[PDB]
């Protein structure tokens, strides 16, 4: 009684059966460019003895095979971030895949409630959870629709247009809210609730800004491959082929959280001069003694000046260029070659080499430019998120990096420079409204920009924030005009309008699916009921 | 501006789609299930993505569990389930499992605000309960498979194996509002994990527990709706989902409506045309501000001589000018009984040829001030209820003030005569007293006895709840007494004794299952590994 | 369109309430609080509409109890509530409630997926649990008034009273996040029913359960910060919401900077210049495909090559072993300047150890580190006496995670701290990760809490017991269940519950529906037809 017995060979079996299964899937040319670290053998003992299906994935393939396509004919999905069901509903007609976006969710969906700046301080579930809210709605949308549909001729279906509600998604998962862990469940939420495709960033967690805010802190390059390759183990257990996207802060960055990784040394800034001293202890010394405000950050500007701050090869040049060195231009060539952004040489290995090449142990300390909190700090720019790019490109479909401003020469500079060791990798840009984008290009440069990008390989677009701004501009207009002109207002601002554009909604009881549902009424009460929604007296007869 | 189909491939898809739904539905499983509306009418409200919930393999597992059962005459026993931690040790002895209504107004509402068996949660709450309790269930099952499949075959052999997948039964209570709710309720049922639900055919704004009083009725059909609203929400998203029907018609004394001539036996009236309605004289009685108040309707009932109205037939032939009484009540009650589904009228018409009276019967006047119909329902009431939910519910239950075996025997012989092969379900309910009710030597034999009628499904409502109040005001008595020797004493010894796997409580809760995960992640070894070298739990080998 | 106001009254309200808040922190209550920031710095950060949190009324009751429990040298003892029916049988007995974060990862995850203790939960997942029980208090709480003050005077007097507001304390792990999430964490717990939360210098996402291995801590200056941010949304939202302050460096081994002297002591480094860096030498290994148990023991031949050590360990080795005069006496000289209390920096302490011996003793911790980047840490019983003095200012209790019941430890921890701080409050985990019946007597047992009592810990908690009296109760019954039917309940349950006066027996009334037949009668003016406890309901 007090246990289930089982065949232990059959158990054998089916354990065998699917690692062979998931093998077989591996295989397919969705994974053609996906690097792996671990064994089928390892993801099947990790699931579960029922397996499960989650629809995601239909949207995942939708997405991929989208993608492909677009990348082939160099033209791109462009998108841009949706809000709540009326906005994919609205979407589905002209777009074809949609962001959720995790600035939005802090000021408008957090599952506490409570509103935020882009910090990704709002509990873990909260755009898992926006996206179970669009998805949702677009599965509704699409289940009201066919009814509408199939309760037609085929005469009249044909006249009557269709929209593809089911518009794969993309949706935030900022830096994967904490440790691996994290990750693995935050993936797990994404797939279970309607995700074809998450994206995460190199920043530290908790640190974390928006991509246009400043004092951004980066993570190891290996630490953020941990993430993604979580991500994978994730969906590679839960069964999804669960689009990937890694972004890059290190565009702009200006900190790090440590040293570790070889890759990343290049770009951490030190100290040249042996006389400065630890600023970090420095500034707490002058605290404690009740230095504040102005006279403090003083000597800050004083100590950065003496340290003289920099990267390790501009420390080598500077040695070579002011040095009793005979054939200066050639000698620096020998090290730049050697040692530079994208050529991932350890410290040890760049001070070894400025040793050969000049004789010196040339000073460099990056521990004493620490930031009180005891980050390092880092000098990117669009080279560093390269060598970013490149390094997580064998374990990310797209590839993505933060820029301050629309500017094409960057985006080309970063498309080359990522192309250039991984040439079939898909590319994504960030189309910002934190960008003054009236003021970053004229008008006919703006109508090609999208397509311009395309040319370069991004496929996908999107604007991070335009739900939130097309929202906010119609709301703030109507209320003006509103408790100006009265409800001459709405006749004049919205209705009129909605009928002439022909947008669905105005007809608001017909597509919240109120039709729909009366079908569901009276087949359950075997064919008729009294009790009908869109029966003889429904005001909607007045737009028609 | 819009996206371009296939009209012809459309079409095609549909009939595919009917052709599916159709077999479907052919299949064993729908031997005893009627469906009132097509495949084509589902499979018009059904949209262009196909989604599977796992839920209803669990539905699978639950009705061949059931056909096993019902084969051998014997019983799938369970009870009412709080938490991740009874799932987890329950699925060691049973095989399905209760998620209760009463246990969630308590201790799972989703507006956290508790409340006695009212119904009056917000939907989502024993839905999201299921969840709770389903995630916990795939989470340890998950577990338990990579702790095997990294032992060898040798090993693996002697390690006892847990199924913690043990198919969940759920409360809707009434459906939480009309039909369109209760295909949004079932919806939600279904996404989140449950084998199968049930639901009770009491009005939803003033749905009581079983064993609550002042319990008031829907019509027959009304709760037939119901039913073939779970059907229909199962049918369109795709699920074997059991359903359960509940009838409290065994107590209540309360309807909202007369208009099922299925009801019209049980709906009590006042044979004297001299009083008038019930309702009003309490009004105008309370407008003046008048216990005294409970002195007029005392005496108004008794004036009144409330009965059904059957009574009232035999009242009159009985004290009556007629010959041959005996056999002239028989001539009525052979055609007018529970069973019989005679309405009033034609109840009256037969009445008045067979003693040339209009009897006088007002069942208006008798009504509450709210509007419900007086009802004498008893076991009778609710195997006419039973027969009449059967076609549309894959078992039928009936609520009882006692464990009367007589009467499960009445209720379960009632229902089989006119549906044979009707499972049955059975309330445990400890809103009885049990060593009062019965001796123990009875008491051990009871569900099996009960198994031989057919009740193939039997819970303990509230034994979660019991069990745990029981444990926790005994420790924390203990525990406020003599420290810590409580802990050793009273849970952590017994814990080890009795083989209990959560004493290794950061292996039970799936440590080493999360540091495969991490290991896996990073590359084969990680630094920050949970159950390494220096964890606590190496004091329990 | 906006809205005019007047800017003289603007500025008039707030200076009224920055005079508001400096009375607040005057109060007794505040007496050993530190705080960094101004009264000016708060008011500032407050709305034009002030709201009162009943959470708050609570901490105020959970400080005077311990105010007194701390006055008589006795404990406050409590344990890990699961559910609504916990907190209600629990009131009878003790005065305080913990709610556990361990136990919410596997029984409360907001988003319904269990786990073991890594507090990666939805954030909102042990805030929303206190609101679970906080509305269950509350709802009892209500439910015994009507019951009482229906009765007379005569009746009530007979009829015992249970206090269901308890104040409860419960777990914010490492906080979930950085600052900002903290302010938010705080805020939730306030707004859902908070007296006191705890709080780990852990680092987020390497979280461990206390007796788990592979912690990873944070620099004392970060995790201070954490708790002047708690303190920080309790001033801001107007709660004396107890903080207190957990330290897991009794037993961890991993930190994530050097950048805070105070931790310099306790890092351990490499005493072998040849040893080069181990991360990269374990990347180099990776990326050819060595994994698992074979990758293990490239890191094991290295460490012992390496010759791992705390700096000050490796001055006496030096001096020990060396070309040196009265060498017990020139360790003293090092030690009674740098030691685990001392604060005393690396840089600091090199330079002693260059002027006492005239070596730069050849020390490097960057190639000890982890490949995750995490510094290696040696902490024990003194390691957490320095960072419970230094939370001291910032919480109102201080607690060590202990991976046995070691009352020698606990003195330890306690004279350690209470010498630099005489007037703290200290918190101990009764935990249920030890084995207690190995561990010690039952003589012992039964006087343990009282003993650590008369040291200070005047909040003491089993983390786990709800979790572990429910799964032996559910799996013993479910076994009697399965072997002998409804006698198992009968005899098991039920007859135990009359016996011993448990009140849920009578489940109907203790689930408030005399209660709620209260407010139906009430609205519908005087009388109903479809009450819930009338004639037919089968409790009688
Ligand atoms: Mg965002
Ligand atoms: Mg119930
Ligand atoms: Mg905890």
């Not at 102005?294 to 000046?305: P, V, Y």
């Not at 990522?418 to 079939?424: G, M, Q, S, T």
């Not at 004049?492 to 009366?518: C, F, L, M, N, R």
């Amino acid at each position: 009684m007090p246990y289930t017995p089982i065949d232990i060979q059959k158990e054998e079996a089916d354990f065998q059966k699917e690692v062979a299964e998931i093998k077989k899937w591996w295989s397919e040319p969705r994974w053609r460019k996906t690097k792996r670290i671990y064994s089928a053998e390892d993801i099947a003992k990790k699931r579960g003895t029922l397996k499960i299906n989650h629809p995601s994935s239909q949207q995942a393939d939708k997405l991929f095979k989208l993608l492909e396509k677009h990348d082939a004919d160099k033209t791109v999905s462009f998108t841009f971030g949706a809000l709540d069901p009326i906005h994919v509903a609205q979407m589905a007609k002209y777009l074809d895949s949609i962001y959720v976006s995790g600035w939005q969710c802090s000021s408008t969906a957090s599952t506490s409630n409570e509103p935020s700046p882009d910090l990704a301080d709002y509990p873990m579930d909260t755009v898992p959870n926006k996206v179970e809210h669009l998805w949702f709605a677009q599965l509704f949308h699409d289940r009201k629709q066919r009814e509408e549909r199939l309760t037609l001729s085929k005469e009249e279906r044909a006249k009557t247009p269709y929209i593809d509600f089911l518009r794969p998604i993309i949706a935030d998962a900022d830096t994967g809210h904490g440790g691996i862990t994290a990750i693995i469940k935050l993936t797990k939420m994404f797939i279970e609730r309607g995700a074809a495709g998450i994206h995460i960033e190199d920043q530290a967690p908790g640190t974390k800004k928006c991509g246009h805010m400043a004092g951004k802190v980066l993570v190891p390059v290996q630490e953020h491959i941990n993430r993604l390759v979580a991500i994978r183990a994730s969906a590679d257990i839960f069964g999804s082929n669960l689009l990937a996207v890694a972004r890059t802060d290190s565009e702009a960055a200006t900190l790090i959280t440590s040293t570790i990784d070889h890759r990343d040394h290049y770009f951490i800034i030190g100290a040249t001069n042996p006389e400065a001293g630890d600023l970090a202890a420095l500034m707490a010394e002058a605290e404690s003694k009740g230095i504040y405000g102005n006279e403090l950050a003083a000597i800050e500007s004083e100590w950065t000046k003496k340290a003289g701050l920099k990267l390790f090869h501009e420390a080598v040049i500077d040695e070579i260029k002011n040095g009793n060195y005979s054939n200066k231009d050639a000698l620096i060539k020998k090290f730049t070659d050697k040692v530079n952004p994208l050529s991932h040489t350890s410290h040890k290995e760049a001070k070894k080499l400025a040793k050969e090449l000049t004789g010196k142990d040339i000073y460099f300390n990056w521990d004493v430019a620490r930031a009180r909190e005891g980050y390092y700090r880092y000098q990117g720019g669009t080279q560093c998120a390269v060598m970013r790019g490149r390094a997580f490109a064998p374990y990310a479909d797209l590839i993505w990096m933060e820029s301050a401003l629309p500017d094409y020469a960057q985006a080309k500079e970063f498309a080359d420079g990522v192309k250039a060791a991984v040439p079939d990798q898909w590319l994504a840009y960030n189309l910002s409204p934190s960008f003054n984008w009236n003021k970053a290009m004229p008008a006919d440069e703006q109508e090609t920009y999208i397509k311009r990008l395309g040319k370069l390989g991004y496929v996908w677009q999107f604007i991070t924030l335009a739900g939130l701004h097309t929202t906010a501009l119609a709301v703030d207009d109507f209320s003006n005009q509103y408790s100006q002109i009265g409800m001459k207002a709405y006749g004049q601002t919205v209705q009129q309008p909605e009928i002439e554009k022909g947008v669905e909604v105005v007809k608001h009881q017909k597509w919240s699916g109120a039709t729909y549902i009366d079908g569901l009424l009276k087949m359950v009460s075997g064919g008729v009921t009294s009790t009908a929604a869109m029966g003889q007296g429904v005001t909607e007869d007045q737009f028609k």
